[PDB]
Amino acid sequence: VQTERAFQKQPQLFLASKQRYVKSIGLKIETPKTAEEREYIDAKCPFTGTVSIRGRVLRGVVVSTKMRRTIIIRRDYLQWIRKYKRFEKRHTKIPAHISPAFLVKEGDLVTVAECRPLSKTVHFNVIHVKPAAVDKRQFRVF
Amino acid sequence: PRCQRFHLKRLTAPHHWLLAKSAGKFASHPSTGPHKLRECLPINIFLRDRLKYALTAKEAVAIVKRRLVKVDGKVRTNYRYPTGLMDVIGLGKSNELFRIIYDCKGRFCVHHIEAKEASFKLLRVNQFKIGAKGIPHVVTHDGRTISYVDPSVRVHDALKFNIKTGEVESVIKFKVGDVAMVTAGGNVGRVGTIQKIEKQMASDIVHLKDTSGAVFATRIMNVFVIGENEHPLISLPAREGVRPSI
Amino acid sequence: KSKACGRLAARKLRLAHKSNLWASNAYRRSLGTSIYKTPLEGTSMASGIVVGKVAVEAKQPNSAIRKAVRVQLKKNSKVVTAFVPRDGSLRLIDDNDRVLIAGMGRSGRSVGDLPGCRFKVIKVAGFSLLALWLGKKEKP
Amino acid sequence: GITRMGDLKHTKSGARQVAWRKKRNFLAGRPSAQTRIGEKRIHAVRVRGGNLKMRALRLETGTFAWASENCTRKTRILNVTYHPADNDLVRTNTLARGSVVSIDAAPFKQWYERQFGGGVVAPELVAEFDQGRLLAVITSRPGQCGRADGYILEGEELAFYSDKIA
RNA sequence: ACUUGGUUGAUCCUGCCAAGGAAGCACACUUAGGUCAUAGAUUAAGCCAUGCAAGUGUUAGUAACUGCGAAUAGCUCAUUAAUACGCUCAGAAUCUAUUUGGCGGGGAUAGCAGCAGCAACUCUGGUGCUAAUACAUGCUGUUUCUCCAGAUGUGAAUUAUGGAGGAAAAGUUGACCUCGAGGCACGCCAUUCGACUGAGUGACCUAUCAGCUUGUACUUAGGGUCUUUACCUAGGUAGGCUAUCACGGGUAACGGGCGGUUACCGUCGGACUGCCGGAGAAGGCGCCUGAGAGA
RNA sequence: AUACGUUCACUGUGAACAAUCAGGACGCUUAGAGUAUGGCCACAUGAAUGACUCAGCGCAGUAUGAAGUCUUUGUU
RNA sequence: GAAAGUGAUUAAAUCACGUUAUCUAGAGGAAGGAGAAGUCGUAACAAGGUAACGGUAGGUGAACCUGCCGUUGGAUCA
């Protein structure tokens, strides 16, 4: 459904005299079933829209579900320190765009992979969710 | 901000070339060409510090401009022209034919060869694409755009190339059980028979074998498929990319 | 025991170490800087014009008057007392000359019997006292 | 000049960011074309790597395109009714991309009888065709391209934008 | 892989202070010879007389014009606390003179000739001509939009390419040197030297710096750019960072390869470092020419 | 129904990534250095290797240490 | 197919406010250290001639004194 001033339109498709464009992203991901039976458009989705996925592929637990079609991960990594022969827990808050194909709560691990810049902060896009139930603030390395 | 810069220093010049740390600061910057900066070897350096004909660099720029030298059919009066892997070098006056090709260790060597062999050369497919009227065409490790190339010509295939006419006579297919000289990294300059090809998700690995019976991997882009099953399509050096080991 | 030993505990060890350096007086003196507000200005040798000649005397038990000149410096325009070594030597220095001053050699602090002053006169008029005291160079 | 550079602006964390260098001609913005209607003229612009972005200042006609029938005629643009970004583009009749502008369609009407007398047509469009001013969208980039052209407004789109005007 | 003098009448301790070894600036006294390396960084990125440092002629464009160069090299470390630098990736979001390989298809001025003006300069006015691989002319593609298909190629593109339509000139039209050979254009695709955009991540102190942030954070549409993005302008939400140290302050802070000290672990220094990358030309700021400059 | 049935950390192995430092060869008259130099009949060479090194990448091994495991009833 | 004009934009420069940091003048005030065998006491070390010492309140030239409550590092391991 199309609320705003501009008419929202699925690109690369002509009505002629509904249809939906759907894309296999590859790298071992099953292109999920709810993309193929749902009214949303989004050009910044991997599957429906026009964003090609490429390069580095991350995992981490979700913090925020607050913005429209954007979430925040925290990647969670150990840093070896040479002197003290011992690691320390570090983290990094990585904001990442979501397709409305997915259904994402707070506090569940996802995967992401990078694309072109969609904003200042966003350069990543969600390609697979695992659900989790039920919290965040665990430190979890993968 | 950096631009395209003329003055190559020694030290920063590559470790192929066997340059003195002394004998001045600057080395000869290669001109732009088919081959890259790092892999190549100019013909200013070729006549100074292999065959040892031109003692000074003034004398080296003399003999290229007399037009005795021929890179690969053509004359080339430009000098400092990058020449690297499988290029023929015909030389006028006391004429000798060479092919430029790697040592055991990674260094360049220079090899007197028979004239009937020294017609042709090999050319690996780097990039395959379509363009102009549905026609497939191929770039090489030179940068020879071989258009109207035949089928069974995919990436990492060699092409034997006749030089007098712009032909592609054979095509040595990539496979298991096929000889391949490595041309970059740590295993640069080494012959191997290809036992395994490991596909790599996204951005792949290939495992090799000497006649001695050592074993070593590399990235796929480094291998140059030299000829089909033991016997290659080329005169190889002394030792034959085996490399000593005690 | 008496510290964190665990595998993940390297933030505790690194950050606790930074605190304990501020107890150490050498790290404290270097870092504070803290050295600039000094007549020397952190320079081993300084030069400038003599104001006059002063008698400062030793503490105890050593009864002796030491003879240290007052010297204005070139670069700061401050004034500071400065010892003159070797017997004679106050007579060799002359009034209102340029002199080169250096440190007492104690890396700061006040040295021998002599309190207050932390400075000795190396040269006068571009010559050096040892040469002058020995008399293998001259002054006009 | 006008800069395309973003280093000066604050981080995500909200930190006062500081320059380390001058402005640079990698990241040079230029002024807007502000592409109105009436009298054709163009200003050529040198860019990175030689080349020409032919910037269009004011354009009369545009090469518009009936999509469903496959037919496309050089047609005179009259006015901007609507634009989804700004109402300022409507007031001064600026041609941007996505700009909903009516067209005379004299050529399209001629096309229908010269072909036919197939065709069929829709009941919304015949309510438009009696006036002789079709709604249509500019799809080109007038400023970069220097040429403006767009397809006719039709189908489910033609319901939507007609409510936004009314 | 090292000890010794100093609190006591004497003792054993804790404990520093000195002594002791190295280098790196500076002062000093003294000095047969050889090779080799370095030398106005520390303070004043303060100021400069004079001389010189970027020009360029081939048997083959015609003193000039024309073509290319001058954006490199050289110098310095004042900014900069991570945006720079390093190290991994990435271009399916890009530009690229020159080389190299494919594919292609007549009139008007400069010196020269002449008349003048300034205290002065590597400033010129005005008339009288003539040059071309300079400039303009001229016997299917390029750019963009719409639609139908979407490869033998990729991890993946409704991508590459093909066909059917319209437009536009922003255009490929060897109008060419030297004696059958050498050389020079024009356009498009690649290639080469690179450039430029984005990501992850590493490290100097400070809590007598605990809250910071309004284009600030997302979204939809546009403008602009070589492209992607609050880069900038609109409409709609109210978000982002923070005790795993945000934000603020300090630096006698250019980063790195590395250098000095050492039994190991470390630790101090890094203008230079015989190299790499960045920044700056008295201080800001702006711009033309060009493949490339905020020179 | 002859390959598939958790991933990591950690270990081994493999890829990837100048000078200096360590180290091999060679009597620069020696040394610090340098990349040479040695054979009287046209020949033979050498300019290795390791470290620089944390992160990121692959296959193999599972002892230790993690995560994986929505149950007043879960999975196909 | 130049100059002049008008409106945009990037704006040096100067004028002015406001903080802010580093330096720096000040009659006086109140401390701290150093040095001369000054003056006034003699508080502490012995049951130091009222055992000392901690917290706190008041007082007096100065050390110190006294009140309330602690400790033994007491002069008692009873």
Side-chain angles (χ1 to χ4, degrees), chain C residues 57-124:
Chain C
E57 52 169 29
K59 289 155 64 61
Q60 202 168 290
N62 298 286
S63 195
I65 305 156
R66 294 284 160 207
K67 302 129 190 82
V69 294
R70 297 281 286 178
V71 181
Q72 197 199 334
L73 302 169
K74 179 60 171 189
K75 73 203 176 176
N76 293 348
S77 317
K78 296 164 182 199
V79 63
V80 69
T81 177
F83 177 70
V84 201
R86 309 297 185 179
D87 37 322
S89 206
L90 194 73
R91 295 183 170 174
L92 300 178
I93 203 173
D94 212 290
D95 289 297
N96 212 96
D97 285 30
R98 293 179 294 169
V99 292
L100 192 133
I101 291 155
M104 291 285 288
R106 190 139 144 74
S107 294
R109 302 270 297 276
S110 56
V111 178
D113 308 335
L114 179 45
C117 92
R118 310 185 291 175
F119 300 111
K120 68 189 188 195
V121 183
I122 305 304
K123 290 157 62 162
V124 54

Side-chain angles (χ1 to χ4, degrees), chain B residues 138-155:
Chain B
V138 162
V139 315
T140 53
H141 86 281
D142 288 42
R144 300 183 181 285
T145 307
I146 306 306
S147 207
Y148 297 101
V149 77
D150 61 310
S152 192
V153 180
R154 302 282 146 270
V155 302

Side-chain angles (χ1 to χ4, degrees), chain C residues 7-8 12-14 24 26 32 39-40 42 51 55-56 64 92-93 98 106 110 119 124 127 136 140:
Chain C
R7 190 203 194 75
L8 314 187
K12 190 65 172 65
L13 292 163
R14 197 186 82 265
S24 196
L40 270 177
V51 179
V56 56
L92 300 178
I93 203 173
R98 293 179 294 169
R106 190 139 144 74
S110 56
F119 300 111
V124 54
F127 274 124
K136 69 188 159 187

Side-chain angles (χ1 to χ4, degrees), chain A residues 81 84 86-89, chain C residues 2-20:
Chain A
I81 315 192
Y84 304 96
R86 270 152 239 194
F87 299 92
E88 48 167 18
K89 302 214 266 273
Chain C
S2 82
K3 52 186 177 201
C5 287
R7 190 203 194 75
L8 314 187
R11 193 172 282 98
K12 190 65 172 65
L13 292 163
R14 197 186 82 265
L15 201 70
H17 173 80
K18 285 203 205 82
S19 303
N20 296 316

Side-chain angles (χ1 to χ4, degrees), chain B residues 217-233:
Chain B
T218 173
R219 285 213 210 287
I220 203 75
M221 199 70 174
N222 299 351
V223 309
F224 187 96
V225 181
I226 204 171
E228 179 58 78
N229 204 66
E230 193 61 33
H231 295 102
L233 307 191

Side-chain angles (χ1 to χ4, degrees), chain B residues 205-219:
Chain B
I205 308 299
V206 52
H207 299 264
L208 297 167
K209 260 219 85 70
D210 294 301
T211 53
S212 296
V215 57
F216 57 94
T218 173
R219 285 213 210 287

